[PDB]
Design a protein around this ligand. Sequence first.
Ligand SMILES: C[C@H](c1cccc2ccccc12)N(C)Cc1c[nH]c2ccccc12
Ligand SMILES: [Cl-]
Ligand SMILES: [Cl-]
Ligand SMILES: [Zn+2]
Length: 314
Amino acid sequence: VRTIKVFTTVDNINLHTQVVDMSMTYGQQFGPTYLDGADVTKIKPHNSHEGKTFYVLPNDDTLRVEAFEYYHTTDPSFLGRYMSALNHTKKWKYPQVNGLTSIKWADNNSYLATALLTLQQIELKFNPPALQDAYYRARAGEAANFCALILAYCNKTVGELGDVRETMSYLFQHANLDSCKRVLNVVCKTCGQQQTTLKGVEAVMYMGTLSYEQFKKGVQIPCTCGKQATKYLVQQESPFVMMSAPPAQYELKHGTFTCASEYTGNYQCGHYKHITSKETLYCIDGALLTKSSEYKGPITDVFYKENSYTTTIK
Ligand SMILES: C[C@H](c1cccc2ccccc12)N(C)Cc1c[nH]c2ccccc12
Ligand SMILES: [Cl-]
Ligand SMILES: [Cl-]
Ligand SMILES: [Zn+2]
């Protein structure tokens, strides 16, 4: 009966020394077991595994508390889905483009690259240590854990096409946006006026207009009475806002926005690029950079900086 010592973990923070029997598979001793994202459940220990860290499923109360404190989910499939994604994302390339960590195109990942670039330019604090830790690694040029976590949190698999807005909506649920506040006023000539207050994620996302300036002046929306009403922004307290709309030709102007999602294609099949405003306009398309003084193209999300806005409309 020969043995080696290894560490098991659910979080890569808390390591648990195990003595393993070299004549049994990891799966027989631990249940589902991963080594650097690879599924080694049906593999027998190797002398070179001595002192290495293996991920296991949280199969006791100690490991369940550790997994919940790290990932902020009790979903028992999570660790498995993370590890399966990570097995592929650790093989992607993470180009430095204009001081930002991007992703070289692979496995329909344009929506993920656009989300990754966006997250480096808006002010957001994630609540799960897993997302905070992986975000810092992605900033340091190694975004594999961060991309695999995004896929697991969004219940998406490597290879699937995706929507930046839906990705941002899920990630914003795991961010501290509690103090974000939005006040709206809607004016219908038939129904009269309606003031509402939104908090949290709803306070920073809007669907139907790209222009923050037009949101402040008033946008036309369908009223429940079948007429068009005017909705405008009374008050915003947030460090950014995200303005989305079905893709349409749109002019982006240097210095008037943080960054933007360009989308070419249809609802099922298409490709994202990312536009960012620095000293001029940069278009980042995975590894590919192109720069211009002006931009006109199919835009679906625009991000703006904010702190505190109050309308002067009385
Ligand atoms: C930007 C785009 C989109 C958003 C909203 C309205 C649109 C209308 C026409 C064409 C595209 C539209 N996403 C990716 C499509 C999309 C949404 N959810 C998805 C889930 C998987 C794959 C693609 C998608
Ligand atoms: Cl793509
Ligand atoms: Cl963070
Ligand atoms: Zn009305």
